[PDB]
Amino acid sequence: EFNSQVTVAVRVRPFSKREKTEKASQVVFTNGEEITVEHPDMKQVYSFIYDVSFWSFDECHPGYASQTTVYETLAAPLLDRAFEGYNTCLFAYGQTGSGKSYTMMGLNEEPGIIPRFCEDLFAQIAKKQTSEVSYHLEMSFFEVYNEKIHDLLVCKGENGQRKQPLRAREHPVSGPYVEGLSMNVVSSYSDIQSWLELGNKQRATAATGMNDKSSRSHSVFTLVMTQTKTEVVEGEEHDHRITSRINLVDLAGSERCSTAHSSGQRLKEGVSINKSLLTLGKVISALSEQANGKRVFIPYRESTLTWLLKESLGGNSKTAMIATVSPAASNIEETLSTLRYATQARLIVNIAKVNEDMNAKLIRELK
Amino acid sequence: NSQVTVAVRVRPFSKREKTEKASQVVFTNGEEITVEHPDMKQVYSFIYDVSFWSFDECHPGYASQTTVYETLAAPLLDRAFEGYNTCLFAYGQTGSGKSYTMMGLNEEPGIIPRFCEDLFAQIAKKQTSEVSYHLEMSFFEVYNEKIHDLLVCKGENGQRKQPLRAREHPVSGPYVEGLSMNVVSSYSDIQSWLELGNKQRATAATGMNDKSSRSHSVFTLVMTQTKTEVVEGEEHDHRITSRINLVDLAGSERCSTAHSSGQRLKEGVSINKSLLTLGKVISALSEQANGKRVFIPYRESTLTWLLKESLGGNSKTAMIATVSPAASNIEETLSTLRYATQARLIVNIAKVNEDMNAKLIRELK
Numbered sequence: 001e002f003n004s005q006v007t008v009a010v011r012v013r014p015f016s017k018r019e020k021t022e023k024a025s026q027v028v029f030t031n032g033e034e035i036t037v038e039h040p041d042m043k044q045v046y047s048f049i050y051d052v053s054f055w056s057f058d059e060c061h062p063g064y065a066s067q068t069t070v071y072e073t074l075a076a077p078l079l080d081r082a083f084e085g086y087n088t089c090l091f092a093y094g095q096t097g098s099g100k101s102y103t104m105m106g107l108n109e110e111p112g113i114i115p116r117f118c119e120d121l122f123a124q125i126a127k128k129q130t131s132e133v134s135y136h137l138e139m140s141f142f143e144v145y146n147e148k149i150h151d152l153l154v155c156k157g158e159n160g161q162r163k164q165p166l167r168a169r170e171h172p173v174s175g176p177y178v179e180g181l182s183m184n185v186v187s188s189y190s191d192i193q194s195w196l197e198l199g200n201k202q203r204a205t206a207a208t209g210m211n212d213k214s215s216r217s218h219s220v221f222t223l224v225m226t227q228t229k230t231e232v233v234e235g236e237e238h239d240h241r242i243t244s245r246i247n248l249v250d251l252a253g254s255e256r257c258s259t260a261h262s263s264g265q266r267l268k269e270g271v272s273i274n275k276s277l278l279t280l281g282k283v284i285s286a287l288s289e290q291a292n293g294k295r296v297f298i299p300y301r302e303s304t305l306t307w308l309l310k311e312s313l314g315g316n317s318k319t320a321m322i323a324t325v326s327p328a329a330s331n332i333e334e335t336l337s338t339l340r341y342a343t344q345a346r347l348i349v350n351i352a353k354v355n356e357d358m359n360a361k362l363i364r365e366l367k
Numbered sequence: 368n369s370q371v372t373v374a375v376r377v378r379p380f381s382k383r384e385k386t387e388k389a390s391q392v393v394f395t396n397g398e399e400i401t402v403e404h405p406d407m408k409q410v411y412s413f414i415y416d417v418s419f420w421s422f423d424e425c426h427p428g429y430a431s432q433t434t435v436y437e438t439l440a441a442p443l444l445d446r447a448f449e450g451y452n453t454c455l456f457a458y459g460q461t462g463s464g465k466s467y468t469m470m471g472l473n474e475e476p477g478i479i480p481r482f483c484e485d486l487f488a489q490i491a492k493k494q495t496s497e498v499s500y501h502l503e504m505s506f507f508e509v510y511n512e513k514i515h516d517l518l519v520c521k522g523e524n525g526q527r528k529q530p531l532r533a534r535e536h537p538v539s540g541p542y543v544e545g546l547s548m549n550v551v552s553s554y555s556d557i558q559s560w561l562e563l564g565n566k567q568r569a570t571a572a573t574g575m576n577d578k579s580s581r582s583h584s585v586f587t588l589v590m591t592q593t594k595t596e597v598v599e600g601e602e603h604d605h606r607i608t609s610r611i612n613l614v615d616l617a618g619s620e621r622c623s624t625a626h627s628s629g630q631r632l633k634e635g636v637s638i639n640k641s642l643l644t645l646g647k648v649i650s651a652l653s654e655q656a657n658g659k660r661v662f663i664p665y666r667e668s669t670l671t672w673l674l675k676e677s678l679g680g681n682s683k684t685a686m687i688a689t690v691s692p693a694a695s696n697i698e699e700t701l702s703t704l705r706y707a708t709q710a711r712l713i714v715n716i717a718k719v720n721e722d723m724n725a726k727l728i729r730e731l732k
C-alpha cells in the first residue's frame with residue numbers, strides 16, 4: 001500500500017582552481033527551489049524543479065547551504081525512518097570534481113554526511129538507551145574498483161600486491177550481498193571515526209587533470225542497526241527486533257579521457273567507471289519508466305554496483321539522491337545529463353516496509 | 368490365566384553424562400517411552416503397561432523406590448500369601464542401574480529389601496500361634512546352559528564350580544539335584560548369603576565394564592504356611608507352599624560392537640539363546656492369557672525349565688526393564704525396549720518439535 005518516492009536533491013559547487021584560471025562564466029543560477037541553466041550562446045534556457053536545492057557557490061550570499069544544513073535537510077529524515085524501522089539509502093551522482101566525496105565524507109575540518117549521521121545516531125541512542133530498548137550496530141565499508149569488490153576496513157598484509165577480491169552472491173530472500181565482508185561492531189562515535197579513517201586511507205585515489213584526489217572507486221558505507229524491544233507476553237520479554245540497513249554511496253565521475261589526461265591504469269580504471277555509470281544510468285532510466293505504467297526489465301547484473309544496490313534503487317528502501325553540479329560553462333552538457341537523470345530519479349517509487357522480523361511466523365496471523 | 372506385567376524404568380543422567388552434555392534421546396508423553404534419534408532419522412514409540420519416569424524430580428510421575436515397589440512387587444507378596452507362585456525378572460545393560468533398581472543403596476532402598484521386610488512384617492502380623500510361617504531360601508546361577516549353586520564356598524583349586532543337573536519330579540515339577548536350601552528369619556540372614564553368592568557369581572571384563580554379569584541369577588524364597596485342624600487330630604495337615612523368584616538376567620551383548628574373543632563368545636551365544644527362549648515363553652503366555660491355545664517352550668533352556676511352574680497356571684510374572692536416556696547408548700536402549708515390548712512397536716517421523724514461532728497453526732487456522 002505504501003509507495004515511497006525517492007528524495008532528489010541538488011548541490012551547486014563553487015568555482016574551482018581550473019575554472020578560475022580559465023575565467024569560466026556562471027550559468028547555473030538559483031531562486032530557491034528551481035535551478036536554471038542559461039546557455040552562453042543564448043539560444044534556449046532550461047529549468048528544473050527539485051525537492052531540495054543547495055547553492056554553495058558563494059560563502060556570503062543568502063541561501064548558502066552548509067554541511068550542517070544539507071545534513072539536517074536530507075539525512076535527519078532518513079535517520080528518523082531508520083529508527084522507525086525502515087531501510088535507507090543516500091547516494092551521490094555527478095561528474096569528476098563536482099563535490100560528491102566532499103558532500104558525503106567531507107574533510108577533516110569540513111565533515112560530510114557520514115560522520116554527522118553516525119554521531120547523531122549514537123546521540124539519539126544514548127538518549128533513548130532504556131532497559132526498554134537495546135541497540136546493536138554493525139558497520140561495513142567496501143569498494144568497487146574495475147568491477148572487482150574490495151574490503152576497506154582491513155589492515156593489508158605486506159606483499160607485492162595485496163588486494164584480495166571478494167565475490168557477490170544472491171541470497172533468495174535477502175537479495176544480493178558480498179561474501180567475505182568484514183562486519184565490525186560499533187559502540188560509539190570513536191570506533192566509527194577510526195574505521196572511516198582506515199577506509200578512506202585504503203580507498204583508491206589518484207591525481208588526474210580535474211581533481212588531484214580523484215576517487216578511482218565506488219564506495220559504500222553500510223550500517224546494520226538492530227533495535228530490540230519488549231512486550232509483556234506469556235513468558236520472558238525481549239521478543240521484538242527491528243533491523244535497518246543504511247547505505248551511503250559515493251560514486252566516481254564520467255571522466256572524459258581528453259580533459260582527464262589519462263593513459264594506462266587511469267584509462268583502464270576510468271573506462272571501468274564509465275561502464276559502471278552507463279549501467280547505473282540505464283537502471284535509473286528504466287526505473288523512471290517502470291513508474292509510468294510501461295513495463296520494463298531493469299538490468300542490474302551488468303554491473304556489480306547496481307547488482308549490490310538492487311534493494312536501494314528499487315525494492316525496499318527509502319532512498320535519496322544527491323546530484324552534484326559545477327556552475328561553469330565548460331561542463332554544460334555533463335551538468336545537464338546529471339540534472340536529467342536526477343529529474344528522472346524523482347519519478348522512482350519504492351515499497352518500503354518495517355522489518356519487524358515476524359512476518360509469516362505468529363503475529364502476521366495475529367494481524 | 369495371567370499375562371506378564373512388563374514395566375520399564377529410565378534412569379537420570381549421571382555425573383559424567385551431565386558434565387559431557389550427553390543429550391536426551393528418551394522422552395515421555397504418557398506412553399512415557401518415545402525415542403527421538405539425535406539426527407531425527409526415526410522417532411520410535413514403545414507403549415508399555417507401566418513405566419517409571421525417574422529422569423527428573425520436578426515431573427509429575429517421578430517414580431521413586433517406594434513407587435516401583437508398591438506398584439509392581441507388593442502384589443507378588445499379597446499373591447504369595449494367597450498360596451501362589453511369583454517371578455520377577457530384571458533386565459538391563461551395563462550402566463542402566465539394574466542393581467540400584469532391585470537392591471538399592473543404603474539410601475533410597477530397593478525391591479529386594481522392601482519385599483523381604485514387608486514379608487517379615489506381614490508374617491509377624493498374621494502370626495497367631497495357631498498359624499505359622501516358615502521361610503527357606505536358595506540362590507543359584509545359570510552359566511553356558513549349566514547350573515551352579517552360589518551359596519557353596521569353594522576351596523583351593525583353579526576353580527571349583529561344580530555342575531548340577533535338573534530333574535523333573537512328576538508332581539513338584541522340575542528342580543535341581545543337589546541344591547542347598549537354607550532357613551531364614553530376618554533380612555540380615557538373606558543379605559549375608561547374597562553378599563556371599565554375588566562374589567562367586569560369574570563376572571568378566573568384556574568390551575563394556577569389567578564388572579558385567581555373564582550368568583543368570585535366581586534367588587528363590589520358599590514359604591510354608593501351616594494351619595492347624597479343628598475337626599480333631601494332627602496339625603500340619605493344612606499346608607500351603609509358595610515360591611517367589613527374583614531373577615537377574617545378563618545383557619543381550621551384540622558381537623558386532625564387541626569383537627568376542629573365544630571364551631567371551633561362548634557366553635554371549637548362551638545368553639542370547641536363553642533370552643530368545645525367555646521371550647518366546649513370555650509372548651506365548653501373553654497370547655495364552657488373551658484366549659489362545661499355544662505351547663510354551665520351557666524345555667529349550669534350563670532357566671525356563673526350572674522356572675516352569677513359576678511361569679504358568681495360577682502364577683504371577685513381572686519383568687522390569689532398566690534403560691538410560693543418553694544418546695550414547697541408543698542401540699542398547701532400543702534393544703532393551705524391543706526385548707520388553709509385548710505389543711507392536713510404532714516407528715515414525717515428523718519434525719513438529721519446532722514449529723517456527725509458537726505453534727503457527729494456533730493463529731493460522
Ligand SMILES: Nc1ncnc2c1ncn2[C@@H]1O[C@H](COP(=O)(O)OP(=O)(O)O)[C@@H](O)[C@H]1O
Pocket residue numbers: 013014056095096097098099100101102103211213214215251252253324
Ligand atoms: N562546497 C564546497 N566548498 C569548498 N570547497 C569545495 C566544495 N565542494 C567541493 N570543493 C572542493 O572541490 C574538490 C571536490 O573534489 P571531490 O568532491 O572529491 O571530487 P568527486 O566529487 O569527483 O569525488 C575538493 O578539493 C574540495 O576542496
Ligand SMILES: Nc1ncnc2c1ncn2[C@@H]1O[C@H](COP(=O)(O)OP(=O)(O)O)[C@@H](O)[C@H]1O
Pocket residue numbers: 377378379381421459460461462463464465466467468
Ligand atoms: N532410577 C535412578 N534414579 C537415580 N539414580 C539412579 C537410578 N538408577 C541408577 N542410578 C544411579 O546410577 C547407578 C546405577 O547404575 P548400576 O546399578 O551400577 O548399573 P547396573 O546395575 O546396570 O550395573 C547408581 O550409582 C545410582 O546412584
Ligand SMILES: [Mg+2]
Pocket residue numbers: 100101214215250251252
Ligand atoms: Mg570522490
